[PDB]
Amino acid sequence: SPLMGGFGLKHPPPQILIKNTPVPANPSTTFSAAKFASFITQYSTGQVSVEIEWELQKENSKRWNPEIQYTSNYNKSVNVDFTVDTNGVYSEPRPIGTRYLTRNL
Amino acid sequence: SPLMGGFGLKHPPPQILIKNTPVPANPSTTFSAAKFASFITQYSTGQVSVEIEWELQKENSKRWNPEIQYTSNYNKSVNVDFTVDTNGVYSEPRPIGTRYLTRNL
Numbered sequence: 001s002p003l004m005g006g007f008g009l010k011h012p013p014p015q016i017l018i019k020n021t022p023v024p025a026n027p028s029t030t031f032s033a034a035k036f037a038s039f040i041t042q043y044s045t046g047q048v049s050v051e052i053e054w055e056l057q058k059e060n061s062k063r064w065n066p067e068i069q070y071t072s073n074y075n076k077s078v079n080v081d082f083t084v085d086t087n088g089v090y091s092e093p094r095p096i097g098t099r100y101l102t103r104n105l
Numbered sequence: 106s107p108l109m110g111g112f113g114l115k116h117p118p119p120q121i122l123i124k125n126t127p128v129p130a131n132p133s134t135t136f137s138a139a140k141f142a143s144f145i146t147q148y149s150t151g152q153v154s155v156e157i158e159w160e161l162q163k164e165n166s167k168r169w170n171p172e173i174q175y176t177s178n179y180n181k182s183v184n185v186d187f188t189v190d191t192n193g194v195y196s197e198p199r200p201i202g203t204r205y206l207t208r209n210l
Contacts, residue, residue, distance in 0.1 A: 065187050068179040072171040082170050 020044055059101055069100050125149055164206055174205050 001008050025038040061067075072081060079085055081093045106113050130143040166172075177186060184190055186198045
């Protein structure tokens with residue numbers, strides 16, 4: 001298991017490597033065997049999509065009393081948590097773990 | 106709708122009426138046209154089972170931030186809520202409603 005948490009994979013999802021192809025600028029009309037150092041300055045943009053399918057493991061508990069669950073504070077506040085501000089900046093207020101339900105040993 | 110809350114039914118679940126059959130005590134060996142007033146004092150006990158099937162209506166919300174949910178207090182206490190005491194007496198600490206999720210108008 002990875003010590004920062006997560007899924008240890010011998011074959012992880014692969015690296016996806018991307019690069020702008022070099023478009024050279026105006027070459028000299030005489031030949032030079034040196035490599036090109038002058039390129040057209042360019043960048044690229046676009047959209048990227050990732051679609052992961054997850055397999056769930058459902059609770060099968062016979063516990064009587066209710067369990068501790070992650071809830072939002074339903075009191076008045078200036079900013080709603082996990083939303084944007086007045087300046088349009090998204091923020092995350094706290095780290096949300098994943099151990100809220102209970103199982104016996 | 107019933108004003109104490111619930112399901113208005115023109116044909117509700119029917120009344121289930123139960124009664125111990127009168128077993129008379131020792132009658133006189135001469136006939137008397139009066140009704141019996143002396144019975145063997147008896148009671149009955151047993152088990153009763155009710156099995157209601159409910160139809161659920163699942164949430165289909167596109168809400169981003171988390172919703173208010175009924176949780177148990179996960180702090181230290183003398184008695185766990187909705188359990189028995191040291192004397193074995195079950196209690197309910199508070200009324201639990203049913204409106205915790207949200208839908209738009």
